[PDB]
Symmetry: C2
Subunit: 652 residues, 2 copies
């Protein structure tokens, strides 16, 4: 029969009219769909999702076809075989509508009249569960959520994202039960978190995996001045608190911020094997060790002085930075790439910072004068850029291809023979892979005069790729031909996209720098506001302890007579006119605070503290004094972390 | 030439005598070996390890051969081609000597005289790094460690386990540098953590992944009475603190303690999709939720009252239980299996506990009377066991195969036709996989009379596998034949191995129960000792506050005059004859403790506390009273968690 024994979940009823078949993603909801359903009349085909990747008749699709009845133009019949309803059931997120599109598109091609008869439904899982206690809620779209929330008689906001979040009987009751359910008929043919979780933030130049990694290292106090911890310690922390995906994705990101050759200003300081340019992998996370770099402390300075807004983590049990204070221009400094739609090259910290300071002095500076500071990108991997034309367009429109060329010299080697010697290569270029191509060319006859080819590259000798040229051969020519047909020259395709005000923008150089400096103003100002506010609160406490201490006799006295902590309280406010807070601070004071030299510690603290409040108001009172702060602090970062440029930009 | 461009790391020197080649595992140490080495004379072949799994000429081996020179009997020459030394370099652990064996064994087969000439060396990485500060240590075997430690003039114990733990220049200096290095020549042909990390502990019946999972849930306060948390939260915690391996291994274990059908007494209470009997997987860990079960609290009760020894986690930054107090017989209750060498079936909590209590009353009870309580295994999945012969041997020797048979009935279905109806199946049996086999038999002609076959199994209807038999056919026969040739009957192979006193033992029933009850005695006694010791300490403090409070006037007085916290201290011990601890408790007392009704809270606390100390000594004073405790507490667990037996053991 049409049964697929062991891949289909068969139903007892035999007339199609009655029967329905759910196409659900295996790992997603398979088991749970199979238990919750009504096996009198409901069938389940849990589809392998990884075989349904990017012919179209694959072992899985073959099952869909043999399960229904029908076929194509060869045996078409809708009046053939079972399931008068086919219900597509997939997750809300990226990999779950990816399948929904693929299942629809297919149907449209081979099973045209399944839609014409309208046997195909999409399922409608709940969308929100709202909480207080014994009063949780199932809602199915946003407009229903305004409705039921604005209603709640005595007065937790959780978005359903995957079907596996749901128990069976809940899947039954909400999504499949002919009674409560509510599906959807299909009629027409075949974006957010994909982007959110992909582009950097213009402000601290990080993507979510990175921010959370760096945040976690901070939250764990893995500072540069304390010993290494095994990477598994960072990865697990991040995985469980902020990034609920494979460790593999997290570790990879962390590894990469730790590579001298990937990052112009490495964010993680790792010990052990972190892979290579040839693309060797890092060793097991339980083996390599890692901590913050000194420079990263700068990415995180002041994060606790209320300078960035924190947001809920993915389950609402933690809090994470929507951004980092990032007190050096990280987006531009270490750049951003990845796999897919942004591409921004690295740059000199010195250059950048000056480039910032020169804006902070004149708001309407054009890329022109900005470029007098920022000559161009500067790669960790060094090497040569070809002109200022690629750079200029990329700084002006935010798009331009830069030509990177390796560093190569021609050396003699006696007996009239010659040698090509590659000291450094272009950024992101897999060296191994290039070596294998140069060699391939030799094999085929596509290039002529290579007698040998060695990758001597080692720590103590840096990059050394060595090409031996025969006697009967010019090397200077062979060299240009290598550029022409090997990664030895590679273009960098500039595409300065990034998150501005939440949404993705394509920024130019200047715009990138402007958005950064405004975030430093924001950050130093918010800091100042926090320090002030934290200082006043403490001084209001000190006001209170002084009063308390000067009159301890009396203080103890009223307390001793007072029956409960509560009457004590009000009895302190009436008698010493202390505020609620001072009264409580007093009550919570410990007898050890009564010793001789402590009273003075207190006066001396209040006295300096009053001055602190002073100079803080002095900053907030005047915006120029506050901007000088931003310049000063940035100048210092520059002096302590600025380095020589590594990449030569030549001209003609 | 013999160069492998892009897979070999070529060396500049050309005479073999000089040259050496390191065979190192890619992901393990590849990148780091390649940087640290001396590329004048050292070559690196980083081998793919997953292709070197369990022909023997594979793409990787082909490289080894083409890299050296030589071959087999076809072109043999040791005087051919480069590398007069081949250095095998692999990890210390399981997957790293696995490769070392495979590389040796191979050599022995195809490259016999490589060893005869002794070109093959094994490398000797350091083994320990000892710490204090600027004084860390590289040692190469245990005997050197006694030597250098027992020596240290002013007076951290870390075992090196993977090469990726090491930086390049360290790998260079310690392991590869002709100078310091020190290798090994090979001459002869081709166990601990594999076991440690595999068998349960007889005591709480857990393996390491499980204990750490359960421990973590406790350390995170994920109790039954607080809401679910996404599994990613447990997995990440465990991964980073205690189990530095893939999340995948951890999640799988956690998922399994949450399945009604896998665990007779589920340890995790999950919400969402946790897979099925047909072997559907759980949904993404960021989607499913989980917490402790009520029963698991029992596995963890008293863990903080110093009842088990804690040990360092894998990096020495955390502490974990070497065992759990486990106040119900978990090993035997939920059993232990896995993939590879132990196999113990589940059992009735009621039975077990009685079975324990009956021992706790007579030490020399034989399996005989023990079995009057514990009739046999009891599977979550229910069904039928075939006799007491399988059970008896397994309880006596610790080995015996038990015959599990599904629950099947034959029902009429009118018009003279019949039906086989499978309500429950044998334990661990993949239902889907069985369905696919029963069907396969029908396809081939190997079995006769099946007209249909359905897996109606659903939540609301439990297991329902339905086999339709034709008119011209006997079903009672067809049924026996199904047992004969399908998982419908499956044997359970009993093999009661477990960790006793650290090392693995094969225990029998009685021995298993004895070791448990002794651990409960240990656990209730240690608890009692902790309560006592914690009670005395607090009473010694209360002794002090009373003195302090009765004379507050004087107390405040001496404190007020005393110049520093230190003189305050000694001035309190001289004047009120308080002990160091009482003096400090006093100094740390807060003024709010001086109110009216607080003095009495203190007297009343001391007074009940004195009684507590009383009854605690009363327990430790007499071992029978302490054993009754163990019986009482176990009786209660039994009453609140005991359930009806699910699996029928028939006889003849």
């Amino acid at each position: 029969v049409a049964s697929l024994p062991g891949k289909l979940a068969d139903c007892s009823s035999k007339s199609p009219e009655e029967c329905e078949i759910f196409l659900v993603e295996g790992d997603s909801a398979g088991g749970s769909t199979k238990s919750g359903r009504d096996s009198r009349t409901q069938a389940i085909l849990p589809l392998r999702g990884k075989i349904l990747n990017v012919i179209l008749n694959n072992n899985e699709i073959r099952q869909m076809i043999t399960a229904f009845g029908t076929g194509i133009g060869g045996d078409f019949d809708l009046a053939k075989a079972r399931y008068h309803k086919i219900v597509i059931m997939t997750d809300a997120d990226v990999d779950g509508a990816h399948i929904r599109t693929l299942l629809l598109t297919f149907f449209y091609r081979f099973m045209r009249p399944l839609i014409e008869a309208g046997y195909v439904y999409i399922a409608q899982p709940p969308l929100y569960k709202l909480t207080q206690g014994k009063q949780k809620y199932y809602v199915y779209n946003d407009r229903e959520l305004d409705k039921l929330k604005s209603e709640l008689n005595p007065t937790s906001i959780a978005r359903y994202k995957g079907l596996g979040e749901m128990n069976a009987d809940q899947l039954w009751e909400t999504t499949m039960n002919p009674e409560h359910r509510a599906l959807l008929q299909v009629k027409l043919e075949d974006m957010s978190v994909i982007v959110a979780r992909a582009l950097p933030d213009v402000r601290d130049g990080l993507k979510p995996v990175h921010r959370r990694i760096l945040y976690g290292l901070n939250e764990q106090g893995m500072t540069p001045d304390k010993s290494y911890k095994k990477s598994a310690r960072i990865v697990g922390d991040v995985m469980g608190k902020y990034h609920p995906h494979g460790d593999s994705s997290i570790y990879e990101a962390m590894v990469r911020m730790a590579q001298d050759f990937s990052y112009r200003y490495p964010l993680v300081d790792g010990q052990g094997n972190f892979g290579s340019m040839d693309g060797d992998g890092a060793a097991a996370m339980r083996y390599t060790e890692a901590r913050m770099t000194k420079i990263t402390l700068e990415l995180l300075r002041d994060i606790n002085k209320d300078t960035i807004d924190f947001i809920d983590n993915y389950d609402g049990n933690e809090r994470e930075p929507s951004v980092l204070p990032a007190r050096f221009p990280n987006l531009l400094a270490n750049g951003a790439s990845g796999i897919a739609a942004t591409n921004i090259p690295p740059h000199n910290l010195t250059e950048l910072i000056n480039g910032v300071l020169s804006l902070s002095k004149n708001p309407d500076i054009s890329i022109a004068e900005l470029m007098e500071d920022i000559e161009g990108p500067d790669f960790p991997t060094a090497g040569l850029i070809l002109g200022k034309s690629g750079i200029r367009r990329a700084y002006e429109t935010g798009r331009g291809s830069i030509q990177m060329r390796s560093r190569a010299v021609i050396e003699e080697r006696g007996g009239g023979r010659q040698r090509i010697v590659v000291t450094e290569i272009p950024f992101q270029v897999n060296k191994a892979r290039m070596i294998e191509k140069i060699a391939e060319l030799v094999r085929d006859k596509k290039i002529d005069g290579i007698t040998d080819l060695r990758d001597e590259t080692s720590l103590r000798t840096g990059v050394r790729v060595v090409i031996d040229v025969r006697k009967d051969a010019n090397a200077s020519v062979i060299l240009n031909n290598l550029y022409k047909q090997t990664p030895l020259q590679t273009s960098f395709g500039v595409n300065m996209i990034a998150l501005v005000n939440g949404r993705p923008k394509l920024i130019n150089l200047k715009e990138a720098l402007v958005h950064y400096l405004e975030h430093q103003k924001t950050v130093v100002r918010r800091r100042t506001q926090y320090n002030l506010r934290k200082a006043k609160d403490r001084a209001h406490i000190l006001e209170g302890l002084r009063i308390a201490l000067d009159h301890i006799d009396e203080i103890i006295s009223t307390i001793r007579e007072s029956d409960t902590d509560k009457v004590a309280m009000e009895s302190l406010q009436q008698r010493f006119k202390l505020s609620e807070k001072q009264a409580q601070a007093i009550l919570d004071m410990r007898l050890r605070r009564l010793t001789g030299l402590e009273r003075d510690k207190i006066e001396a603290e209040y006295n300096e503290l009053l001055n602190y409040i002073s100079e803080l108001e002095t900053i907030l009172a005047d915006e120029e004094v506050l901007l000088q702060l931003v310049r000063d602090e940035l100048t210092e970062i520059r002096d302590r972390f600025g380095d020589d440029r590594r990449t030569e930009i030549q001209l003609g």
